């Protein structure tokens, strides 16, 4: 998609019907749907308080 | 991948439609900017662990999307310093963005070099970030005044 | 305190404002939270037979909730 | 001990310590960078230094003070 959107004339017309908007939409959407994975407070307490797979 | 796990995709195509040509930057940044909740969702995004984007990217995106007007302006500059909340958030609504995981008023390098080019830059309408900043530091000592 | 104060009226809520007061985000006062969590994680498990020691942590845990359901 | 003292309060207003509140400070907290890592294991040294010194002072202090009173000159009152 990044690779489509290489010419201004692309970019423009990408513009034209709206792609911004709905792209800005998804992303609001998909924030607000998923949940993050990454490790937190709660992970960290838990280290504390005690390939590579084992 | 990051991409498929999380929500960075989107964003990095904003990122590349915002600053791939920086003639096409500013009708960009107009027709992206109206956009409901769009500046909360990019503040939670920047101010999370590395998910797939750096966050000097992000940073780029904030700047270039809030300097188009006085507006969006004052909003990235409340949403930064005051309530990171999703506007319009309603709990009993179950589709509404709720972003409810963040601390208000965390600050982090990105965060402060934001600022800084929110004040610093010259164009019209500075003078109300100016005074935004100014009344935020009013009523964060107004507010210490709690005894 | 455990031995002395344990098991009495007072105790739990007493348990409930130190940590609200200790690990509020509010709170500046830098101090181990890790060595403090396991001396009230045991101070909790003994003087469990204390019947306000759960319903004090629970109450604390139903007003930090309340921003939702409002 | 003066000096080491200064060595250790330099050293350590160097350093500074993320308050755990956020998703950024918690993941600083599972992986120590490499450059904290060196810095707390040059703090742990300079502690030891200046805490064994200490002990050395404090024992030289105890062995004169013991001395000084063993002659017949009066501790203070």
Same mark, same amino acid.
């Given at each position: 998609?990044?690779?489509?959107?290489?010419?201004?004339?692309?970019?423009?017309?990408?513009?034209?019907?709206?792609?911004?908007?709905?792209?800005?939409?998804?992303?609001?959407?998909?924030?607000?749907?998923?949940?993050?994975?990454?490790?937190?407070?709660?992970?960290?307490?838990?280290?504390?308080?005690?390939?590579?797979?084992? | 991948?990051?991409?498929?796990?999380?929500?960075?995709?989107?964003?990095?195509?904003?990122?590349?439609?915002?600053?791939?040509?920086?003639?096409?930057?500013?009708?960009?940044?107009?027709?992206?900017?109206?956009?409901?909740?769009?500046?909360?969702?990019?503040?939670?995004?920047?101010?999370?662990?590395?998910?797939?984007?750096?966050?000097?990217?992000?940073?780029?995106?904030?700047?270039?999307?809030?300097?188009?007007?006085?507006?969006?302006?004052?909003?990235?500059?409340?949403?930064?310093?005051?309530?990171?909340?999703?506007?319009?958030?309603?709990?009993?609504?179950?589709?509404?963005?709720?972003?409810?995981?963040?601390?208000?008023?965390?600050?982090?390098?990105?965060?402060?070099?934001?600022?800084?080019?929110?004040?610093?830059?010259?164009?019209?309408?500075?003078?109300?970030?100016?005074?935004?900043?100014?009344?935020?530091?009013?009523?964060?000592?107004?507010?210490?005044?709690?005894? | 305190?455990?031995?002395?104060?344990?098991?009495?009226?007072?105790?739990?809520?007493?348990?409930?404002?130190?940590?609200?007061?200790?690990?509020?985000?509010?709170?500046?006062?830098?101090?181990?939270?890790?060595?403090?969590?396991?001396?009230?994680?045991?101070?909790?498990?003994?003087?469990?037979?204390?019947?306000?020691?759960?319903?004090?942590?629970?109450?604390?845990?139903?007003?930090?909730?309340?921003?939702?359901?409002? | 001990?003066?000096?080491?003292?200064?060595?250790?309060?330099?050293?350590?207003?160097?350093?500074?310590?993320?308050? @755990? &509140?956020? #998703?950024? *400070? /918690?993941?600083?907290? +599972?992986?120590?960078?490499?450059? !904290?890592?060196?810095?707390?294991?040059?703090?742990?040294?300079?502690?030891?230094?200046?805490?064994?010194?200490?002990?050395? @002072? &404090?024992? #030289?202090? *105890? /062995?004169?003070?013991? +001395?000084?009173?063993?002659?017949? !000159?009066?501790?203070?009152?």
């Amino acid at each position: 998609i990044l690779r489509v959107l290489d010419t201004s004339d692309a970019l423009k017309a990408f513009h034209d019907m709206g792609g911004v908007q709905l792209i800005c939409n998804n992303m609001v959407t998909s924030t607000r749907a998923i949940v993050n994975t990454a490790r937190s407070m709660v992970s960290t307490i838990m280290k504390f308080l005690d390939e590579g797979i084992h | 991948d990051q991409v498929s796990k999380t929500s960075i995709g989107w964003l990095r195509l904003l990122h590349h439609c915002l600053t791939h040509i920086s003639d096409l930057e500013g009708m960009m940044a107009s027709a992206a900017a109206p956009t409901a909740n769009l500046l909360q969702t990019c503040a939670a995004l920047l101010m999370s662990p590395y998910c797939g984007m750096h966050s000097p990217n992000i940073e780029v995106v904030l700047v270039k999307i809030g300097l188009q007007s006085t507006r969006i302006g004052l909003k990235l500059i409340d949403i930064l310093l005051r309530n990171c909340a999703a506007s319009g958030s309603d709990p009993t609504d179950l589709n509404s963005p709720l972003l409810f995981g963040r601390l208000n008023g965390l600050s982090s390098d990105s965060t402060i070099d934001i600022l800084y080019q929110l004040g610093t830059t010259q164009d019209p309408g500075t003078k109300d970030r100016i005074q935004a900043l100014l009344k935020w530091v009013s009523d964060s000592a107004r507010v210490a005044a709690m005894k | 305190l455990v031995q002395l104060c344990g098991g009495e009226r007072w105790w739990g809520q007493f348990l409930s404002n130190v940590l609200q007061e200790l690990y509020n985000s509010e709170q500046l006062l830098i101090f181990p939270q890790d060595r403090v969590f396991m001396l009230l994680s045991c101070i909790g498990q003994r003087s469990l037979s204390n019947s306000g020691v759960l319903e004090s942590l629970l109450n604390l845990l139903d007003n930090l909730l309340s921003p939702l359901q409002p | 001990y003066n000096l080491a003292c200064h060595r250790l309060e330099t050293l350590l207003q160097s350093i500074d310590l993320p308050p @755990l &509140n956020s #998703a950024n *400070n /918690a993941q600083y907290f +599972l992986r120590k960078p490499d450059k !904290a890592v060196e810095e707390d294991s040059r703090v742990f040294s300079a502690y030891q230094d200046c805490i064994q010194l200490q002990l050395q @002072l &404090n024992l #030289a202090h *105890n /062995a004169v003070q013991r +001395l000084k009173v063993a002659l017949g !000159a009066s501790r203070k009152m």
